[PDB]
């Protein structure tokens, strides 16, 4: 799975998280089996 | 206030919206103990002290 967010919201990308992403549009299951891998992209994704 | 003599307000006799507070993402932290910030809206108190 892959996409862009504001860095403040990386915390929402985990099993059983909550907020304007994790409630609506990218819920992860409470028994998720995998890795969440994130980095700053201000050099690519800001204008 | 200056932390040597921090201020405190009692909050009472009112209707809260902790979702609006939790949605103020300008808050660099919202760390909670004995409660989860979502569940505050389902839950209520004799007083809140800020």
Q: Do B25 and A8 touch (CB under 8 A)?
A: yes
Assess contact for A26 and A13: CB atoms under 8 A.
yes
Assess contact for B41 and B48: CB atoms under 8 A.
no
Resolution stated for this PDB structure, in Å: 3.3
Q: Do A8 and B38 touch (CB under 8 A)?
A: no
Computed from CA positions of residues B22, B23, B26, B28, in that sequence, does the dihedral angle turn out positive or negative?
positive
Closest Cα of chain B to A42: distance in Å?
A: 19
Which structure tokens are listed for A28? Answer: 């992860």
Q: Please give the Cα distance from B8 to B31 (Å, whole number).
A: 19
Neighbours of A32 (CB within 10 A): 13
* Stretch (H or E) spanning B49: strand B48-49
Q: Please give the Cα distance from A42 to A47 (Å, whole number).
A: 9
> Largest alpha-carbon pair distance within chain A?
38
Assess contact for B49 and B8: CB atoms under 8 A.
yes
Q: Please give the Cα distance from A10 to A46 (Å, whole number).
A: 17
Which structure tokens are listed for A11? Answer: 């915390």
Q: Please give the Cα distance from B37 to B17 (Å, whole number).
A: 11
Task: Tell me, yes or no, if B25 comes closer than 8 A to chain A by beta carbon.
Answer: yes
Q: Which residues contact A7 (CB under 8 A, 6 or more apart)?
A: A40
Closest Cα of chain B to A43: distance in Å?
A: 22
Is B22 in a helix, a strand, or coil?
helix
């Amino acid at each position: 799975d892959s996409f862009v967010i504001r860095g403040d919201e990386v915390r929402q990308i985990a099993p059983g998280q909550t907020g304007k992403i994790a409630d609506y549009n990218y819920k992860l299951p409470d028994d998720f089996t995998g890795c969440v891998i994130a980095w700053n992209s201000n050099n690519l994704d800001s204008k | 206030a200056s932390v040597y003599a921090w201020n405190r307000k009692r909050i009472s006799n009112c209707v809260a919206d902790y979702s609006v507070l939790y949605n103020s993402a300008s808050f660099s932290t919202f760390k909670c103990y004995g409660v989860s910030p979502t569940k505050l809206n389902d839950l209520c108190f004799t007083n809140v002290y800020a």
